[PDB]
C-alpha cells in the first residue's frame, strides 16, 4: 500500500484512444524509477527537465500518469514544441514540460486482422489544444457556412478517425502505447529516499 501503482497504468490490458487520453493521479506513495527504466523494454524513454536515472530521490506533491495509444510515427509528436494531428488536436505537452515520455510497441496487443477500429484520434478541429487539454466531443465538424445539424455530408465530417490497426502495417503505423509522467508540486510522492 506504499508503492505507487505504476503497474496499474503500464501493465493494463487496454488503453484509451489518444483523443480521450487517460490520466491517473498519483499521490502518497514511493516511486521506484529503477523498476521503471532499468527494465528497459520501452521503444522510447525520454525525460525532459529531469535526469531519467537519479530521479527516485526527489519528492513531489503529486504525479500524473497519462496513458493512450497512437501510431508509431506519432510518438515523436509526444514532446514539447511539436506540431501535428496528435499534438494539435489529441494530446499537447506544454512548451516547458518537466517529466518523462515512455512508449512501447503494442502490435501484439492492439492489432486485429481486419483492423482494430476501437482506437480513434481526432482528425478535425478548428484550433490547437491548450497543453494537457482533453476533447471528447463527437459533434459533426462544420467545414462550411451551411450548418450540419449533426449529419454527415459535404463540409460535414465526423471529427474522429479510426486507426484501424492491422498487424501487417508498417511499424510506424502499428499501435504504440504511451505513458507521460508529469511531476507537480506538501510533497508526498517520493522515490526511495
Amino acid at each position: 500500500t506504499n508503492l505507487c501503482p505504476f503497474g496499474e497504468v503500464f501493465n493494463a490490458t487496454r488503453f484509451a484512444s489518444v483523443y480521450a487520453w487517460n490520466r491517473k493521479r498519483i499521490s502518497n506513495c514511493v516511486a521506484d524509477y529503477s523498476v521503471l527504466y532499468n527494465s528497459a523494454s520501452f521503444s522510447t524513454f525520454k525525460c525532459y527537465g529531469v535526469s531519467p536515472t537519479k530521479l527516485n530521490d526527489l519528492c513531489f506533491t503529486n504525479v500524473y500518469a497519462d496513458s493512450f495509444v497512437i501510431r508509431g510515427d506519432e510518438v515523436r509528436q509526444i514532446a514539447p514544441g511539436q506540431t501535428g494531428n496528435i499534438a494539435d488536436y489529441n494530446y499537447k505537452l506544454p512548451d516547458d514540460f518537466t517529466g518523462c515520455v515512455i512508449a512501447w510497441n503494442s502490435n501484439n496487443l492492439d492489432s486485429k486482422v481486419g483492423g482494430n477500429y476501437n482506437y480513434l484520434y481526432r482528425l478535425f478541429r478548428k484550433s490547437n489544444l491548450k497543453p494537457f487539454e482533453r476533447d471528447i466531443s463527437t459533434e459533426i465538424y462544420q467545414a462550411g457556412s451551411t450548418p450540419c445539424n449533426g449529419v454527415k455530408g459535404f463540409n460535414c465530417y465526423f471529427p474522429l478517425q479510426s486507426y484501424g490497426f492491422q498487424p501487417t502495417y508498417g511499424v510506424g503505423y502499428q499501435p504504440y502505447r504511451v505513458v507521460v509522467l508529469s511531476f507537480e508540486l506538501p510533497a508526498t510522492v517520493c522515490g526511495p529516499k
Partner: antibody
Amino acid sequence: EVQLVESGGGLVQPGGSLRLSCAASGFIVGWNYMSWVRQAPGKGLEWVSVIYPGGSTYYADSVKGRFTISRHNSKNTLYLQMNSLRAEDTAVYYCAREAYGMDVWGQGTTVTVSS
Amino acid sequence: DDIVMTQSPSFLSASVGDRVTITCRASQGIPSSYLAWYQQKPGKAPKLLIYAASTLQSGVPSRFSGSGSGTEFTLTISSLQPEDFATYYCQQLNSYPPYTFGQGTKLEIKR
C-alpha cells in the same frame, strides 16, 4: 459556387518571387486542410504545401525555406508565397481542399521560371 | 523512411466496354483510408474519383471501383467508356506530410 479560382502565376527569373492567390467559395478556407500541389510540363502531381485548420503548416522538402503558405480569413483566400524561385519550380500550381482525399481543386495557374 | 507509390502499368490500352485494372503499390503497409484515386484529362485539373481506397466520391459513375489494402490497391473501371480515357493517379494521404502520388497511368484506346 464551390470553386477555387487561382491567380498570380507568371514569368520570373531564378531568384524571383511570386505570390499565388486562391479564392474559395462553397467552404471556409480557415476551417479546412488546404494544400498546394504542382505539376511540371508533362510530369505528374507533386504535393507542395499544406495548412491545417488549427494553423500548423508543412512543406515539401524541395520548397522548405523558400515557400510559405498562408491564408486571409476575411477574403477567404489561400496564398502561396514563392521566393528564390528555382527553374525546377516551373509548373501548373493548384490549390485544393482535403476532406477525405482532395475533393475540390482549382483551375490552376502557371508559374514559369527562366532567365 | 518515406512511402513510395508505384503504379502499374504506366500506359494501358483498352476498348469501350472493356474492363480495366490499375494497380498502386506502397513501399510500406499503410492504412487503407490513406489513399485516393484521381482522374485527369489533358489541360485540366485532377478530379477526385475514390477515397479511403474503396469509397466512391459523390457524383462519380458506378463503373469506378476501388479496392485493396496493405501494400496493394486497385482502381477498376468496369465497362470502359469514351469519357474515361485519361490519366489516373493514386495518392496516399499520410495524416503527417508528405502526401505522395503515383507515377500515373495513361489509359489509351486499343487499336
